[PDB]
Design an enzyme around this catalytic site. Sequence first.
Site, PDB file in Angstrom:
ATOM      1  CD  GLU A  79      -1.370   0.041   3.664  1.00  0.00           C
ATOM      2  OE1 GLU A  79      -1.815   1.191   3.860  1.00  0.00           O
ATOM      3  OE2 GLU A  79      -1.699  -0.958   4.357  1.00  0.00           O
ATOM      4  CB  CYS A 111      -2.054  -4.568   6.415  1.00  0.00           C
ATOM      5  SG  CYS A 111      -3.285  -4.142   7.596  1.00  0.00           S
ATOM      6  CG  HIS A 233      -2.334  -7.166  10.311  1.00  0.00           C
ATOM      7  ND1 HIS A 233      -1.179  -6.842   9.635  1.00  0.00           N
ATOM      8  CD2 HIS A 233      -3.010  -6.008  10.488  1.00  0.00           C
ATOM      9  CE1 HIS A 233      -1.156  -5.539   9.417  1.00  0.00           C
ATOM     10  NE2 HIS A 233      -2.256  -5.011   9.921  1.00  0.00           N
TER      11      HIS A 233
HETATM   12  C1  COA Z   1      -2.429   2.398  18.309  1.00  0.00           C
HETATM   13  C2  COA Z   1      -3.099   3.750  18.352  1.00  0.00           C
HETATM   14  C3  COA Z   1      -4.566   3.576  18.152  1.00  0.00           C
HETATM   15  C4  COA Z   1      -2.862   4.415  19.685  1.00  0.00           C
HETATM   16  O1  COA Z   1      -3.424   5.698  19.767  1.00  0.00           O
HETATM   17  P1  COA Z   1      -3.257   6.638  21.051  1.00  0.00           P
HETATM   18  O2  COA Z   1      -4.538   7.545  21.174  1.00  0.00           O
HETATM   19  O3  COA Z   1      -2.026   7.499  20.884  1.00  0.00           O
HETATM   20  O4  COA Z   1      -3.079   5.722  22.336  1.00  0.00           O
HETATM   21  P2  COA Z   1      -4.281   5.107  23.182  1.00  0.00           P
HETATM   22  O5  COA Z   1      -4.860   6.142  24.126  1.00  0.00           O
HETATM   23  O6  COA Z   1      -5.384   4.550  22.197  1.00  0.00           O
HETATM   24  O7  COA Z   1      -3.650   3.920  24.016  1.00  0.00           O
HETATM   25  C5  COA Z   1      -3.066   2.831  23.354  1.00  0.00           C
HETATM   26  C6  COA Z   1      -2.627   1.923  24.451  1.00  0.00           C
HETATM   27  O8  COA Z   1      -1.485   2.153  25.301  1.00  0.00           O
HETATM   28  C7  COA Z   1      -2.073   2.580  26.566  1.00  0.00           C
HETATM   29  N1  COA Z   1      -1.487   3.454  27.572  1.00  0.00           N
HETATM   30  C8  COA Z   1      -1.562   4.869  27.585  1.00  0.00           C
HETATM   31  N2  COA Z   1      -0.773   5.293  28.578  1.00  0.00           N
HETATM   32  C9  COA Z   1      -0.200   4.196  29.169  1.00  0.00           C
HETATM   33  C10 COA Z   1       0.659   4.077  30.195  1.00  0.00           C
HETATM   34  N3  COA Z   1       1.138   5.243  30.877  1.00  0.00           N
HETATM   35  N4  COA Z   1       1.093   2.797  30.597  1.00  0.00           N
HETATM   36  C11 COA Z   1       0.650   1.695  29.956  1.00  0.00           C
HETATM   37  N5  COA Z   1      -0.235   1.817  28.899  1.00  0.00           N
HETATM   38  C12 COA Z   1      -0.652   3.053  28.511  1.00  0.00           C
HETATM   39  C13 COA Z   1      -3.523   2.023  26.596  1.00  0.00           C
HETATM   40  O9  COA Z   1      -4.380   1.914  27.641  1.00  0.00           O
HETATM   41  C14 COA Z   1      -3.525   1.159  25.347  1.00  0.00           C
HETATM   42  O10 COA Z   1      -3.695  -0.203  25.310  1.00  0.00           O
HETATM   43  P3  COA Z   1      -5.074  -0.873  25.501  1.00  0.00           P
HETATM   44  O11 COA Z   1      -5.908  -0.703  24.178  1.00  0.00           O
HETATM   45  O12 COA Z   1      -4.737  -2.377  25.753  1.00  0.00           O
HETATM   46  O13 COA Z   1      -5.785  -0.260  26.678  1.00  0.00           O
HETATM   47  C15 COA Z   1      -2.517   4.645  17.294  1.00  0.00           C
HETATM   48  O14 COA Z   1      -1.147   4.618  17.294  1.00  0.00           O
HETATM   49  C16 COA Z   1      -3.071   4.363  15.911  1.00  0.00           C
HETATM   50  O15 COA Z   1      -4.195   4.710  15.564  1.00  0.00           O
HETATM   51  N6  COA Z   1      -2.146   3.687  14.983  1.00  0.00           N
HETATM   52  C17 COA Z   1      -2.595   3.205  13.691  1.00  0.00           C
HETATM   53  C18 COA Z   1      -3.489   1.985  13.768  1.00  0.00           C
HETATM   54  C19 COA Z   1      -3.834   1.402  12.397  1.00  0.00           C
HETATM   55  O16 COA Z   1      -3.137   1.613  11.431  1.00  0.00           O
HETATM   56  N7  COA Z   1      -4.962   0.515  12.291  1.00  0.00           N
HETATM   57  C20 COA Z   1      -5.255  -0.144  11.010  1.00  0.00           C
HETATM   58  C21 COA Z   1      -5.027  -1.629  10.951  1.00  0.00           C
HETATM   59  S1  COA Z   1      -5.673  -2.571  12.295  1.00  0.00           S
END
Ligand code: COA
Length: 388
Positions: A79, A111, A233
């Site tokens: 992609e 993906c 994945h």
């Molecule tokens: C992964 C993603 C969603 C995270 O976004 P974010 O708003 O920055 O982070 P989040 O608030 O959602 O938290 C992610 C996680 O780490 C966490 N976290 C935040 N602070 C933390 C801390 N101090 N200690 C431990 N964990 C912590 C969460 O609670 C969590 O895991 P969980 O879902 O098991 O609870 C983001 O990087 C993203 O959108 N990436 C792209 C995803 C993608 O491409 N999807 C398509 C294919 S599936």
Amino acid sequence: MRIGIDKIGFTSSQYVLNMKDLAEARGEDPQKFSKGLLLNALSIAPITDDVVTLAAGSANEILTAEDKEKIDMVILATESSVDQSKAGAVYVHSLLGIQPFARSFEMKEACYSATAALNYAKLHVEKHPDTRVLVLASDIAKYGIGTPGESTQGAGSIAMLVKKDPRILILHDETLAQTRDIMDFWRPNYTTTPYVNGMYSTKQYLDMLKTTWAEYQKRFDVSLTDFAAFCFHLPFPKLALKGFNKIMDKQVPSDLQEKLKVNFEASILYSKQIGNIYTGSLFLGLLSLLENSQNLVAGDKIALFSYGSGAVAEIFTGTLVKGFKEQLQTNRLDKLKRRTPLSVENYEKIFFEEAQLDDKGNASFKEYQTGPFALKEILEHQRIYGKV
Ligand SMILES: CC(C)(COP(=O)(O)OP(=O)(O)OC[C@H]1O[C@@H](n2cnc3c(N)ncnc32)[C@H](O)[C@@H]1OP(=O)(O)O)[C@@H](O)C(=O)NCCC(=O)NCCS
């Protein structure tokens, strides 16, 4: 007739962004990355190491002269394309010196697409059992500075050689896919970075996993206990862990629960150091599993869950072949440690660099660290690739 994956190659870029450094620059709790995402570091690619060069590098890891004589199909799943018409596979075909009477093309569906590539490869070889097929799953996951997805970036390519009497994994014909029209993640033509609703994508990944696996079990009369490992994945390892927990249950006997868990942990080892590689991520996890599990043996079956946003999912399976370890590498983690760490400042400059074209379509680039192949220049709109 046994058809499947004979060899697996992997190439990443030559630079790494350590998650603790990103956390410091962004004012994030570093544990969000180390525990939340289960990521330690991400591969960063300079402008001169793209889908084509990574793909060619990954194939260069595994192909022999005999392979090059017998391959008659080259498929690039990506992609991260660099042309809207010309398949990146054509460049790989050329750079690798594959025999001319081959078809070469690209597949696209987020993906997911390397799964379709592998399936076509398998059927093609079954029909023409003297032939071989090269499948490349190559991508650079680039989300943008300050975006939620910045922490789930990465770069790399998996190459898989498919042929009769494979030395690693026999592929089976029991497959099930599902398509559902959603907008969890996508990338319009005018943007180098995707739009993504992270939480929604996680929910959809998990629902397509649940529903596809339920239907798979029904159609094919299998259950979790038929498999020694499950691969997912891997956009980030926490999502795969959610997938693992989603399909697992406590009706699995305790000894198998333990084995499946240890194998899950083995499967995410490389991704923790590399980040998201889109199409290649499932297969990187397969490679990580095979190179790091201490319990897999010939005849063990592996179930694989492929996902692509937008969205398409597929479950398929394979059986390990006696001697598979002979085709693997033991020092891949050591090789990954060779990557040059970047400051956040330098990562920002390097990862997001774009070509500066003059009015005739010419662009020049600084020399960066690459693998064996590099983008050298753009000459009147032609991307010029060569061996370094
Ligand atoms: C992964 C993603 C969603 C995270 O976004 P974010 O708003 O920055 O982070 P989040 O608030 O959602 O938290 C992610 C996680 O780490 C966490 N976290 C935040 N602070 C933390 C801390 N101090 N200690 C431990 N964990 C912590 C969460 O609670 C969590 O895991 P969980 O879902 O098991 O609870 C983001 O990087 C993203 O959108 N990436 C792209 C995803 C993608 O491409 N999807 C398509 C294919 S599936």
